[PDB]
Amino acid sequence: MSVIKPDMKIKLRMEGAVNGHPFAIEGVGLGKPFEGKQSMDLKVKEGGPLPFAYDILTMAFNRVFAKYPENIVDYFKQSFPEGYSWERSMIYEDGGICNATNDITLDGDCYICEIRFDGVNFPANGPVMQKRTVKWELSTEKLYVRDGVLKSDGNYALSLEGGGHYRCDFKTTYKAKKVVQLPDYHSVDHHIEIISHDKDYSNVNLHEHAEAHSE
């Protein structure tokens, strides 16, 4: 409402590991919460060059940046200034599994994001460790309430170099840090795109566009 302004800043840090390889990434960005658009620059600070496909990280790098119509309750904009956190599992069809958490606070007009990301069991000759992902397809997140918190599922797909898709199931729990009104069942369509990158993805610009709907 009054704390959500049309243009807001983003600071984040992610620490994590993939198949035991640790790394850390920092980012700064800008977003438009009511238009559902955001953009961010990300720099690898430790563990570079990353030995795995960057695309498994990008949806971990905040549903306040989503366009919500009048007739759908917006769990995320209500939760500020105190904010919310999420917990997420990402189960890839070849057995790679990633867990992640994000804790989101608001300092003035700047969202502060603290991310932990941990992936295991990616096969050495699979598309993640061989880096042959191209992009995520448009992703439809389905959100529902259970036990007083907000959950969501998605059946997402990375298109691969040489063709074919690489499927991943997402399971997220969102936890507001104060009592807010709970929404009914609805969807959010997500388009995420790596806009720019250097040699080894040590510098990446990332863009997201997202809108909610229920009919």
Q: The CATH number of the domain where 204 resides is what?
A: 2.40.155.10
Using CA of residue 149, residue 69, residue 187, residue 100, what is the dihedral sign? Answer: negative
- Rounded to whole angstroms, the Cα distance separating 170 from 181 reads 24
- Compute, in degrees rounded to 10, the torsion defined by CA atoms 53, 55, 56, 61: 130
- Rounded to whole angstroms, the Cα distance separating 191 from 189 reads 7
Instruction: Locate 16 and state its tokens.
Output: 């994590």
Instruction: Yes or no: say if 176 and 152 are a contact pair by the CB < 8 Å rule.
Output: no
Query: In total, how many domains does the chain have?
Result: 1
Its domain, for residue 83, covers 1-215
Residue 2: CB atoms within 10 A of its CB come to 6
